[PDB]
Amino acid sequence: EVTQRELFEFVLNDPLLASSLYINIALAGLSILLFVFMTRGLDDPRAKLIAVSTILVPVVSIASYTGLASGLTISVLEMPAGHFAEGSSVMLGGEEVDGVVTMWGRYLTWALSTPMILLALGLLAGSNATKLFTAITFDIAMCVTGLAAALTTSSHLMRWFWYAISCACFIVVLYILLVEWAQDAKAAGTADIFSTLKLLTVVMWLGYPIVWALGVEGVAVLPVGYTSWAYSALDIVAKYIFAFLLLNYLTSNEGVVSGS
Amino acid sequence: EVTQRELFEFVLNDPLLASSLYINIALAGLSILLFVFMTRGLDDPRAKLIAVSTILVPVVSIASYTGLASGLTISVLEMPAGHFAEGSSVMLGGEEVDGVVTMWGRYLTWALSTPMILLALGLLAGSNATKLFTAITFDIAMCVTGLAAALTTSSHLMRWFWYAISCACFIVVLYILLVEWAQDAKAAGTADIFSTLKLLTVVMWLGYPIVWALGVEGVAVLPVGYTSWAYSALDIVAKYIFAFLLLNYLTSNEGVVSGSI
Amino acid sequence: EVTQRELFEFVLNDPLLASSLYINIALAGLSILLFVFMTRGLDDPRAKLIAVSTILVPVVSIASYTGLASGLTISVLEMPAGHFAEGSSVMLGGEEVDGVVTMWGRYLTWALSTPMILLALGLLAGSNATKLFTAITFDIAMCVTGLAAALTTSSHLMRWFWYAISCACFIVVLYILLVEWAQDAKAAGTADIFSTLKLLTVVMWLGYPIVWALGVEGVAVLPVGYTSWAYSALDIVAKYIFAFLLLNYLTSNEGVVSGS
Ligand SMILES: CCCCCCCCCO[C@@H]1O[C@H](CO)[C@@H](O)[C@H](O)[C@H]1O
Ligand SMILES: CCCCCCCCCO[C@@H]1O[C@H](CO)[C@@H](O)[C@H](O)[C@H]1O
Ligand SMILES: CCCCCCCCCO[C@@H]1O[C@H](CO)[C@@H](O)[C@H](O)[C@H]1O
Ligand SMILES: CCCCCCCCCO[C@@H]1O[C@H](CO)[C@@H](O)[C@H](O)[C@H]1O
Ligand SMILES: CCCCCCCCCO[C@@H]1O[C@H](CO)[C@@H](O)[C@H](O)[C@H]1O
Ligand SMILES: CCCCCCCCCO[C@@H]1O[C@H](CO)[C@@H](O)[C@H](O)[C@H]1O
Ligand SMILES: *C/C=C(C)/C=C/C=C(C)/C=C/C1=C(C)CCCC1(C)C
Ligand SMILES: *C/C=C(C)/C=C/C=C(C)/C=C/C1=C(C)CCCC1(C)C
Ligand SMILES: *C/C=C(C)/C=C/C=C(C)/C=C/C1=C(C)CCCC1(C)C
């Protein structure tokens, strides 16, 4: 029975792990302060909705990363027969424990933050309610089935079946970003900025399922420490710089996005 | 003590249980493909909202049933003194384990899918936001208190108290379906189709608390495998057939439901 | 180790704890009946939306208190080194068990009920969607980070860090309540009733983080039983009397909240 304290201490004493986590807690906090400063001039309710949705991204990130750092949202799971990480062991407390240190808490970071990123993008693109609803519901389904895949230890094949379902949901979100909102942004007069944020988002988001496949959750070419840093690097771009670019535009183009 | 693998293997090797779960994974998948194909011609935003809300039903179902088949959302619980399934055994891994294989994952299938069924129906009936909000919130309360009932092992009476709270929430949903939306559909011009789907929905949904009461969660006249098939059969009609019928109407009457979201 | 039945019995057989839980189950139930009766004459859809949102408060409360009374949402946690409740015992069943009985179920009562309180108040004040969204999202964040604080056992300081994050989110909600909705209510013609409900909400809500700090979750000057009654008393006011007052006004001013 691994304790929360043992996982908290495990993160510590492990350079790659501890740094990938605490650096994001710090960047998330600094991002929030910066973004609040940047948007104090906004008055339009719609511009402010986009701003708050955007600021909620680093808010969810600081809370969720603290969930990981504290050990609260970390568990030790034993992979099923055939899985590349099956047979692995980790030193926890004063004994060797079978399994993999599983940072399932990252899925909470994703399920709560990705909907805010999508809401901000859709509002920016002048999306109607149907498309926002579709993008957000399928995005949440993608995140939850991804968590289910990571939490499945009964069967190797089942883990990848979950992965396939999640990818299917991801395709829906990608279609809306690349095809529908890309067109809607033209009518909203935000075609240029949306194009930039869209490219950034699509490229970075595609990185997550790749890291999943290569990291300990997948074929394990990337160890627990590198897997964590891979995800943390993606978050810095998909969340913090994405948010800065969006807000930097918003604070200089409040008139453009003002509306009902 | 009991592992996910042991539960996964228990489901496999158990013909009734295995089939009740995997057949729905298959039917939900085929439903998604069929529904996406059927609705490819839709252009109106409101019509498309009704379409996506309906399609989300089998999407939630396939994911949720995978949760059950994989063993992820199944647990072994020991019923409280006096419960008709108290003292049951299950044989897992290789030994006899006290308790009942509890497929609590079904409550997730319900909590995430029923709001979508209701959203689709409310929109079809031309419901205002107040009634949709009321129907959906009490519907979620119904499924969550139902899950709590199944997860309660401390007291037999408590299990049924949760069941009673859930039933009361169910009454709110039934009232909205039978009284409010029944009338709203006439103004929306969808009276014939809504009344039909309203009736099909009410009849099938009534089956769930009956199965709960008769199954292993209740008086246990229905063993685990039979309780599972009862729910899976209800799901096939309340979800897949229901959705197929709604989409059939939708794709031939886009203009009728078109308008401001 | 500790079973649900053992926690269920711990609550029973303890006059203080049992009364603090079962009384609210009774009051919540009676409140639902009373409120439904009180609002049976409403016809306006906007007024009805405010009424349902309000009625959901005691609905969530009766379900959540049943979660606690049944033992379903209670756990036994061992506090970290430095915590004032470290090395505590309880006697679960008939044995001496290390740790403190943690009624984390209360956070569920809060995360699901507070958004409904805020939705009702925001609508009464004639708030736009942006402010409602901001108040509700940060309110949920406050509740979830508070839950995380209570569930954290890896570090004593980590618990207070979660507490700090939660307080920051609370300030956002307080700002909207005290500054923004105070103004909106004037234009909506509900300034007088809002002032009353606003005052009651702010004063009562401020009490929760105080009880947290003083109870077993914090410095532990208040035993498990007194911590429970403190929250239960706050709930009676922040929920039931608050709801009654709002509904009493609502039914007497249906036309004003309707708009036209
Ligand atoms: C395993 C779960 C995966 C299910 C994937 C099916 C989702 C179908 C969503 O509908 C489609 O959404 C597009 C973007 O909004 C519309 O352009 C298109 O017309 C509509 O048909
Ligand atoms: C429609 C959803 C698709 C998921 C299909 C999952 C079924 C895979 C079952 O695998 C088998 O399980 C046995 C018992 O655990 C092992 O002994 C055996 O070695 C393994 O190969
Ligand atoms: C609306 C549906 C009706 C549900 C009725 C539920 C009745 C079940 C009561 O349980 C029994 O209560 C006794 C006293 O508390 C216990 O001594 C006994 O062990 C326990 O099994
Ligand atoms: C809608 C379904 C109705 C549910 C009815 C549940 C009744 C359960 C009856 O069980 C019995 O209760 C006795 C106490 O009264 C116990 O002493 C006895 O051991 C127990 O077996
Ligand atoms: C408002 C609804 C609240 C439900 C309250 C349920 C109380 C039922 C208490 O039953 C008793 O519990 C003891 C401890 O487990 C058993 O030893 C005893 O045999 C059993 O009869
Ligand atoms: C630990 C997380 C705490 C971070 C809190 C910062 C969130 C910033 C929310 O934006 C602010 O909301 C106010 C009320 O709506 C507006 O009056 C103000 O103009 C706007 O800038
Ligand atoms: C702040 C975090 C962000 C933007 C996270 C994005 C995550 C994804 C796009 C994840 C996608 C996945 C799949 C498509 C397949 C299964 C595994 C996942 C969950 C990694
Ligand atoms: C796809 C699943 C559907 C349509 C499920 C519907 C479920 C219900 C109507 C459940 C109702 C219940 C009660 C009213 C009492 C307590 C037990 C439940 C949860 C089975
Ligand atoms: C019905 C319940 C109500 C109105 C609950 C309100 C709760 C709060 C305002 C809680 C606030 C907290 C903090 C600000 C800090 C950390 C701990 C909490 C969760 C108790």
Side-chain angles (χ1 to χ4, degrees), chain B residues 126 176 255:
Chain B
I176 290 177

Side-chain angles (χ1 to χ4, degrees), chain B residues 25 60 62-63 65 70-72 82 85 89-90 107 110 140-141 152 165 170 203 208 211 222 225 237 240 245 261:
Chain B
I25 288 179
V60 164
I62 195 169
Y65 268 102
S70 73
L72 175 61
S89 300
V90 293
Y107 294 87
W110 308 348
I140 295 175
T152 294
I165 295 179
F170 182 33
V203 173
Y208 293 80
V211 171
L222 273 39
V237 183
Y240 318 139
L245 299 181
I261 306 174

Side-chain angles (χ1 to χ4, degrees), chain B residues 2-261:
Chain B
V2 179
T3 66
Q4 214 186 83
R5 194 201 316 87
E6 298 175 324
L7 287 171
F8 168 74
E9 306 198 325
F10 178 84
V11 170
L12 291 178
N13 301 318
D14 183 335
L16 266 189
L17 208 46
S19 59
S20 74
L21 261 26
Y22 288 96
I23 290 304
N24 276 173
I25 288 179
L27 292 180
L30 295 171
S31 289
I32 292 168
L33 298 177
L34 173 64
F35 298 166
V36 170
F37 174 73
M38 289 175 71
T39 53
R40 66 191 190 297
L42 258 25
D43 290 305
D44 182 72
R46 190 169 187 279
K48 298 196 76 177
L49 209 214
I50 294 174
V52 187
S53 186
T54 302
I55 287 173
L56 276 165
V57 172
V59 168
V60 164
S61 192
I62 195 169
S64 290
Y65 268 102
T66 299
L68 294 171
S70 73
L72 175 61
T73 58
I74 295 179
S75 296
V76 176
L77 303 181
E78 298 182 55
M79 293 300 103
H83 186 287
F84 284 53
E86 71 190 301
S88 301
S89 300
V90 293
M91 209 65 75
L92 273 46
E95 281 62 62
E96 183 187 304
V97 181
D98 280 352
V100 301
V101 174
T102 303
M103 305 222 292
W104 58 265
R106 282 192 182 280
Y107 294 87
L108 280 58
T109 306
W110 308 348
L112 296 172
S113 68
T114 53
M116 296 302 91
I117 287 172
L118 256 22
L119 212 209
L121 279 175
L123 289 174
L124 178 66
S127 173
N128 64 23
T130 299
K131 297 180 191 175
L132 244 353
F133 175 86
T134 305
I136 291 168
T137 51
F138 279 92
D139 170 81
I140 295 175
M142 172 189 78
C143 59
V144 175
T145 49
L147 168 62
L151 255 30
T152 294
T153 63
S154 63
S155 160
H156 191 190
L157 198 62
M158 272 287 195
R159 286 180 64 86
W160 292 101
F161 178 63
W162 284 112
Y163 181 95
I165 295 179
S166 185
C167 284
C169 293
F170 182 33
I171 295 173
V172 178
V173 178
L174 290 172
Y175 180 90
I176 290 177
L177 285 167
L178 295 172
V179 178
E180 298 299 315
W181 292 350
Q183 291 306 299
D184 292 347
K186 298 182 179 182
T190 56
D192 292 348
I193 183 67
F194 177 75
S195 192
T196 299
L197 298 182
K198 168 203 69 176
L199 229 51
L200 179 61
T201 295
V202 169
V203 173
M204 298 308 109
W205 286 40
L206 283 171
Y208 293 80
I210 291 174
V211 171
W212 195 103
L214 292 170
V216 64
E217 294 150 318
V219 68
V221 292
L222 273 39
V224 177
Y226 303 80
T227 291
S228 187
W229 252 113
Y231 284 135
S232 290
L234 289 173
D235 277 3
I236 291 173
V237 183
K239 291 176 163 71
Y240 318 139
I241 287 51
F242 161 85
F244 184 34
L245 299 181
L246 193 162
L247 262 24
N248 174 243
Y249 167 83
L250 185 61
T251 57
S252 287
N253 294 278
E254 182 176 12
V256 180
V257 306
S258 292
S260 178
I261 306 174

